[PDB]
């Protein structure tokens, strides 16, 4: 019954092909609700969920200003990190920032986060106390020093423990039919021979929300984790998710294998069997 709001921002330098590409998106749990793309015509923060559309002009003007301000900061950051790492003008680099807050079933604060990455790797992140920083190499220590001198953690903490949770609750209320739902997975297993001595057993979960799910195979009750191909949970495109897990088994042994499904919409975890 637990929820989260997260904003994700990516900027990519493109030396000689314009100013950096900037993309921003916001989510409540697994549902996207807003986006911004610097290469789009509108130059506005735009709705991506029907329940956010009701926010008035002040909201959209305000979110547009903020997201443009984020974009400008990341543009500066790209030049700064080049200097910190002594990198050349010519190559393309990526900065990513994500932040947000988590609340429990009662919608009270659990934790917040605010993290940054340069070229695919941790750079700097607020620690769980929201008062100090973890800096992942020496360039990030420079950033820590400047951010500590500027009292950045204090204003981030006021947002993460206050504003962030307050807007999350508002979204959860306004978007309740979409966001407070739980759709339990529809499960089945398929069987296809891959030769006359081996068969693929694939355990499927379809049409579920939220995205979080566990799929496992057992053989005589022993977990088969090293032998299981597990795909990334994937969007169906309609607001729900899909996932499967497969094992290749000697023909004749099917009845030894069971698939186990855990999801918050199930009243009990499921066990699917071949007998």
């Amino acid at each position: 019954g637990s929820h989260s709001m997260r904003y994700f921002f990516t900027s990519v330098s493109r030396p000689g092909r314009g100013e950096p590409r900037f993309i921003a998106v916001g989510y409540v749990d697994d549902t996207q609700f807003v986006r911004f793309d610097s290469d789009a015509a509108s130059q506005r923060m735009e709705p991506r969920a029907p329940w956010i559309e009701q926010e008035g002009p002040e909201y959209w003007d305000g979110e547009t200003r903020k997201v443009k301000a984020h974009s400008q900061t990341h543009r500066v950051d790209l030049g700064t990190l080049r200097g910190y790492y002594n990198q050349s003008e010519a190559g393309s680099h990526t900065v990513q920032r994500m932040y947000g807050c988590d609340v429990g079933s009662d919608w009270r604060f659990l934790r917040g986060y605010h993290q940054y990455a340069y070229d695919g790797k941790d750079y700097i992140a607020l620690k769980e106390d929201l008062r100090s920083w973890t800096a992942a190499d020496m360039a990030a220590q420079t950033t820590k020093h400047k951010w500590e001198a500027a009292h950045v953690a204090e204003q981030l903490r006021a947002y993460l423990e206050g504003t962030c949770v307050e807007w999350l609750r508002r979204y959860l209320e306004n978007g309740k039919e979409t966001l407070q739902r739980t759709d339990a997975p529809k499960t089945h297993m398929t069987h296809h021979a891959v030769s006359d001595h081996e068969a693929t057993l694939r355990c499927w979960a379809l049409s579920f929300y939220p995205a979080e799910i566990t799929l496992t195979w057992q053989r005589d009750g022993e977990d088969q984790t090293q032998d299981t191909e597990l795909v990334e949970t994937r969007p169906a495109g309609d607001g729900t998710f899909q996932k499967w897990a497969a094992v290749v088994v000697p023909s004749g042994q099917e009845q030894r294998y069971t698939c186990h499904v855990q999801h918050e919409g199930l009243p009990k975890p499921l066990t699917l069997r071949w007998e």
């Binding site: 904003y7 921003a24 916001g26 909201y59 305000g62 979110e63 903020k66 997201v67 301000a69 984020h70 900061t73 500066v76 950051d77 700064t80 990190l81 910190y84 920032r97 932040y99 605010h114 940054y116 750079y123 700097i124 950033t143 400047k146 951010w147 500027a150 950045v152 204003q155 981030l156 947002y159 504003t163 962030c164 807007w167």
Partner: peptide, 9 residues
């Protein structure tokens, strides 16, 4: 609603 007071590195 997104944050404010985000600084450059």
């Amino acid at each position: 609603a997104a944050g404010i007071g985000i600084l450059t590195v």
